[PDB]
Design a protein around this ligand. Sequence first.
Ligand code: G8Z
Ligand code: G8Z
Ligand code: G8Z
Ligand code: G8Z
Ligand code: G8Z
Ligand code: G8Z
Ligand code: G8Z
Ligand code: G8Z
Ligand code: G8Z
Ligand code: G8Z
Ligand code: G8Z
Ligand code: G8Z
Ligand code: G8Z
Ligand code: G8Z
Ligand code: G8Z
Ligand code: MG
Ligand code: MG
Ligand code: MG
Ligand code: MG
Lengths: 226, 226, 226, 222
Amino acid sequence: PWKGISGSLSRISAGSVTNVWGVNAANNIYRYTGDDAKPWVQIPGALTDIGAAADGTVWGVNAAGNIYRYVWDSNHWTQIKGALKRISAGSRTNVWGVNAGGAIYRYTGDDANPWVQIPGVLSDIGAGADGTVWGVNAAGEIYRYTGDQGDPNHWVKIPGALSAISAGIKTNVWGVNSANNIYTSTGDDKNPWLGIGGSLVDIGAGTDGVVWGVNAGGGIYRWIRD
Amino acid sequence: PWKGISGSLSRISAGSVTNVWGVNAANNIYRYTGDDAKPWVQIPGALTDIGAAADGTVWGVNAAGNIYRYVWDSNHWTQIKGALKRISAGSRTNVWGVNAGGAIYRYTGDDANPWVQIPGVLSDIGAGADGTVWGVNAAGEIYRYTGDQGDPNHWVKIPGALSAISAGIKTNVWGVNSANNIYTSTGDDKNPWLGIGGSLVDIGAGTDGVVWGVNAGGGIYRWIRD
Amino acid sequence: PWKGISGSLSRISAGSVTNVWGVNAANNIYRYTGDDAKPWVQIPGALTDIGAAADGTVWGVNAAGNIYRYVWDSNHWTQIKGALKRISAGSRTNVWGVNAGGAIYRYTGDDANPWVQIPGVLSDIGAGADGTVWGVNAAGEIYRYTGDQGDPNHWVKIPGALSAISAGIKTNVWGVNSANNIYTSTGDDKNPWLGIGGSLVDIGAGTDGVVWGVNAGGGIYRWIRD
Amino acid sequence: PWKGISGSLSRISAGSVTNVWGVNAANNIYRYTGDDAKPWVQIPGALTDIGAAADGTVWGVNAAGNIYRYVWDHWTQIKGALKRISAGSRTNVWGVNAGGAIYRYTGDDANPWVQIPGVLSDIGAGADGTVWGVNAAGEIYRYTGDQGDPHWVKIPGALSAISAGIKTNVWGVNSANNIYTSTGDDKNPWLGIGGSLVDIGAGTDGVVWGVNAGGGIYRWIR
Ligand SMILES: C=CCO[C@H]1O[C@H](CO)[C@@H](OC)[C@H](O)[C@@H]1O
Ligand SMILES: C=CCO[C@H]1O[C@H](CO)[C@@H](OC)[C@H](O)[C@@H]1O
Ligand SMILES: C=CCO[C@H]1O[C@H](CO)[C@@H](OC)[C@H](O)[C@@H]1O
Ligand SMILES: C=CCO[C@H]1O[C@H](CO)[C@@H](OC)[C@H](O)[C@@H]1O
Ligand SMILES: C=CCO[C@H]1O[C@H](CO)[C@@H](OC)[C@H](O)[C@@H]1O
Ligand SMILES: C=CCO[C@H]1O[C@H](CO)[C@@H](OC)[C@H](O)[C@@H]1O
Ligand SMILES: C=CCO[C@H]1O[C@H](CO)[C@@H](OC)[C@H](O)[C@@H]1O
Ligand SMILES: C=CCO[C@H]1O[C@H](CO)[C@@H](OC)[C@H](O)[C@@H]1O
Ligand SMILES: C=CCO[C@H]1O[C@H](CO)[C@@H](OC)[C@H](O)[C@@H]1O
Ligand SMILES: C=CCO[C@H]1O[C@H](CO)[C@@H](OC)[C@H](O)[C@@H]1O
Ligand SMILES: C=CCO[C@H]1O[C@H](CO)[C@@H](OC)[C@H](O)[C@@H]1O
Ligand SMILES: C=CCO[C@H]1O[C@H](CO)[C@@H](OC)[C@H](O)[C@@H]1O
Ligand SMILES: C=CCO[C@H]1O[C@H](CO)[C@@H](OC)[C@H](O)[C@@H]1O
Ligand SMILES: C=CCO[C@H]1O[C@H](CO)[C@@H](OC)[C@H](O)[C@@H]1O
Ligand SMILES: C=CCO[C@H]1O[C@H](CO)[C@@H](OC)[C@H](O)[C@@H]1O
Ligand SMILES: [Mg+2]
Ligand SMILES: [Mg+2]
Ligand SMILES: [Mg+2]
Ligand SMILES: [Mg+2]
């Protein structure tokens, strides 16, 4: 079930139990501390979406579409040229975004030439440490990336409808639909989703299995198995 | 202690908290969902043993000795030539089996030429993500693989008796004996086993520390530390 | 909060949930079993500090300054030439120590020529699986290693005062001050520490998020998030 | 077998599915985009060998022997001279120089290399600490200098290029261009894999990429 955690957030991303970040409605940025008694520390800056990876990589975008990577020093963030609306970092080497037109981009590893457009149209995306990438489009159709596995069409459609998706590793894929219903991937593409009790508007599914979410009213939860 | 989980299984393998599979007595295949309220989803096919790795690799064998690897798409399984009785996958690159004659094989990474025989005789085997491999023979003697570390005899005998063994990583080795008594490796080859309260016929020890087991009556348990 | 664990230890190191070692005041060596009902097994030998990594690497030093690496066989330990007072192993490839004069050394991977001196003076050090290295000096000043990232001064000073530090991965850094007060890194170098309720003299912060500590009276604790 | 990926390269390294780099004959540097349809982006600079790690680490050497580490913001020169280089991770970086002496990165940019006893012409360094090498003559060695062997153990066979992503993912080519992968059995160490290649890069996650004499690029399809 979900454990309620104090605080208020609008979006959230979890790469591992030790690297969990979110933004609130005012665009303040927070990082989870590891202590549920005082779970959040505000990190300076302003973001509207964030992607945090198991390896410590953190990327964000702001209201204007400006893109940032955390540099783990007193400068805090560095702006990376281009414009994005949503972003997910599975690792240093697997960072993806969606711009305001729905175009899909992948970080090239070159800050001087940082993005290559990957064919397709999405509204949210979730990238993993192992190369896993899932997305959803504005109508809720769900896709898994195949463009690095020889598929000239780049994406395979997986049945169902979701509005937010996260995939920190191949085996930890979660999403929510437009009515806030929570789902997790079964690993069977022909019976792909299990409904999970609860209600969320965004979700972050980590490489080590950690799952965090936020609901419509800004309430924050972590998934508890044991 | 052990947390009882609903369902009924005959064998089980855990590569990580997010990749846990089992088979029941009817040879139905199940994958753990991450929700203990509804812990299992049946995956189509029929298997008598399964090996699931932290990296998502899943291998199985059926009653006839047919060998399969999960392809994480709508085809579900692909049959790999050869015949095995027991199988363990520590990773994509560390997959081992034992055939009905007790001969030991290692997956070569070439589906057209998939197995090389490794000297020795075993009845169960457990392979890890870091290359770790342990086995037991029909009389219960316990061995750890040394054939990739210069040892011309391939295996070092470790004192004790076990009938099932699992080793998802060097530091997470568990087994059961023929009387269903549970043991975990101490890491001291001269005092190698600690008895653990409980009773199990098969056990799966994951790379991230997760431990699952099944008992003689098909009852399922996950190890809880906290 | 902290879960009390039975036993008595003077120092402790945790690389992952499955690789946690400590030494007691008599210099006996123990490894955590994974069962809190019987949490420790004594490993033969005598050490005054130990460093245990996620990948299974374990290094120690004894009262005389002798340095040892665990060989995961019936020989138990191998002595490595040189003299150290404190040691930390983040991985097989990231092992650091501090000698009795405060000089800082890094394991070269060559047992015949095992140490290179890294400029600076420390009293405790903590190394990670991802290359992360933090240290503190005798006055409590805190430093993070930058000498493999182009910095000719080798260390960046981070505000605060600590007497023991551990850093199993970039995102899991913990320390204690000389008054036994516990702190964890926020990831903001300008607001770097969060106070954690409790009292400890040594702490081990694992690559997978596990955190163990020992207090002044030898009492042992594991950090619990859920 | 192998899937042909468009382009042409002379040397290649894969640390993981998502970190694959190569250089072409002209010494132009390329990184795999993750899009098989538009598979390469050129990275500024000139190199003759490159090593890419699972954690994103990238090191290279130029024709002259200058050594560079990629900075992910393009290249910083690190003091010394090397002819080949491999990086399994930030903390496991090895190379050989033109005369065949073997070096490992110290983790100290101001004092960056320590020489390791022996003679090699290619080397593969893994994320888990695994190091394999081949000598001019084609003899194959695995490193044991960090586990009590006063350094290298010879494994039978002959190879001209070698790559190790992990203890369990080791590949090489012989001078005839035959491809081999390590079996995990020192007494029967090699399995021949169908095809012909001149360089190969093997990742920790099982990823394997290669280039043939003519510059054709291939990814192994398990
Ligand atoms: C702002 C610079 C150019 O913009 C276009 O190309 C860039 C990529 O070069 C996009 O940024 C990711 C942006 O969203 C848009 O599609
Ligand atoms: C008609 C096909 C092209 O676009 C469609 O398919 C592509 C994928 O092929 C989607 O991009 C992810 C897009 O959202 C849409 O559903
Ligand atoms: C029309 C059938 C599917 O709709 C429902 O069930 C499916 C799951 O089977 C959801 O897809 C993820 C969808 O969002 C919705 O809740
Ligand atoms: C079924 C094909 C040939 O069988 C023999 O060799 C193969 C290996 O080539 C074995 O399969 C693993 C099988 O068990 C047996 O020993
Ligand atoms: C007499 C030695 C050969 O076989 C024995 O030793 C080998 C190992 O050397 C065992 O194989 C794992 C086998 O089960 C048996 O115990
Ligand atoms: C005869 C002494 C050993 O037997 C018992 O204890 C040992 C453990 O010390 C078990 O070995 C794993 C064995 O299965 C049995 O339960
Ligand atoms: C004991 C051998 C030589 O000692 C000196 O150099 C060695 C390093 O070569 C140090 O051991 C780490 C020791 O502490 C001292 O500084
Ligand atoms: C005056 C500077 C040299 O030493 C100081 O700085 C160095 C770091 O530059 C410290 O070493 C870690 C040392 O402890 C001390 O604080
Ligand atoms: C003088 C101000 C700082 O001192 C206190 O707070 C700081 C934390 O802000 C501690 O630094 C880690 C220090 O040890 C002490 O407890
Ligand atoms: C057909 C295009 C010419 O190939 C050029 O660009 C390609 C990349 O588009 C290079 O392949 C890696 C090739 O080496 C050369 O520089
Ligand atoms: C001086 C700039 C152009 O090339 C030089 O520097 C670049 C790096 O800036 C090297 O490429 C990696 C190249 O080999 C050469 O040494
Ligand atoms: C200037 C020093 C001479 O360089 C020697 O040692 C250096 C390292 O100190 C080597 O670079 C790796 C170089 O190849 C050569 O053997
Ligand atoms: C005493 C032997 C010196 O060199 C031989 O053995 C060494 C290894 O001991 C090789 O270096 C890796 C070298 O290439 C050669 O085969
Ligand atoms: C003695 C056998 C001849 O060696 C052949 O096969 C071996 C492997 O058995 C190759 O070594 C990797 C070698 O290059 C050659 O092709
Ligand atoms: C056409 C089959 C034989 O070789 C061709 O294709 C193979 C791959 O199918 C290449 O080996 C990797 C080889 O270099 C060549 O390009
Ligand atoms: Mg997101
Ligand atoms: Mg099994
Ligand atoms: Mg310590
Ligand atoms: Mg190479």
